[PDB]
């Protein structure tokens, strides 16, 4: 994954898995987020409205 586009694709493929596992190191079990970045932004907007 030497190319900028290859590195970015790797990052996108792993970032959510990583955050789940990362949070587990803090002792918290959370479900895996499978949303795309755009979907996550739209869901964040709903959650802000909800609070």
């Amino acid at each position: 994954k030497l190319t900028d586009k290859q590195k970015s694709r790797l990052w996108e493929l792993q970032r959510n898995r990583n955050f789940q596992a990362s949070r587990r190191l803090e002792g918290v079990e959370m479900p895996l987020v499978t949303l795309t970045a755009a979907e996550a932004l739209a869901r964040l907007e709903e959650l802000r409205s909800h609070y």
């Binding site: 792993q14 990583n18 955050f19 596992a21 795309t36 932004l41």
Partner: protein, 188 residues
């Protein structure tokens, strides 16, 4: 604590007044924000680490991205004194930059340097909440720029915290052992 309302609860942007509900909202919102974080640059100093934290916490805290302003303990062990964070953080990032962000290294050497830098940043604990999360994203991205990839899967929390503590006291053996497992070749 200046981060608390003048109660049991940290001041927050969501007008939540119950600590447990704030915790849960943070777990959910940080996880959605982490789904939007891009790889970022090869050249990464303290401002890039602050940007990760800002990204994660921008919905929750006005202070997202800002350095910690109080002292924090894990048990009886203090993290870096707050007034020293900027000086120590900058110095550490400068050492990292002089090592070219760990690029061009064979696996054993990468693991060794990574454990070292991970240990140093962990003691720094630059943010009031979420330091661990921001630090790990910073290093996950760094690894990919360096031709490696990190997985935190299957690392036990107790082993993780003990490894970091031993490392901060001068024996990086346990943290390097964890990193030998966490690290694999990029795209492998």
């Amino acid at each position: 604590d200046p981060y608390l309302y003048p109660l049991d609860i940290m001041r927050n942007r969501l007008n939540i007044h119950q600590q447990q509900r704030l915790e849960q909202a943070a777990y959910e919102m940080t996880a959605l924000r982490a789904a939007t974080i891009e790889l970022g640059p090869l050249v990464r100093r303290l401002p890039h680490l602050r940007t990760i934290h800002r990204q994660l916490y921008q919905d929750i805290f006005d202070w997202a991205g800002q350095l910690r302003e109080v002292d924090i303990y894990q048990g009886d062990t203090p993290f870096c004194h707050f007034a020293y964070i900027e000086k120590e953080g900058n110095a550490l990032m400068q050492d990292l930059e002089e090592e070219g962000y760990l690029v061009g290294l064979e696996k054993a050497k990468f693991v060794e340097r990574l454990a070292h830098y991970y240990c140093e940043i962990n003691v720094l604990h630059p943010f009031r909440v979420g330091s661990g999360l921001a630090q790990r994203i910073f290093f996950e991205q760094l690894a990919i720029h360096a031709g490696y990839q990190l997985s935190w899967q299957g690392i036990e929390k107790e082993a993780w915290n003990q490894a970091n503590q031993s490392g901060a006291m001068g024996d990086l053996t346990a943290l390097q052992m964890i990193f030998s497992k966490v690290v694999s070749e990029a795209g492998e």
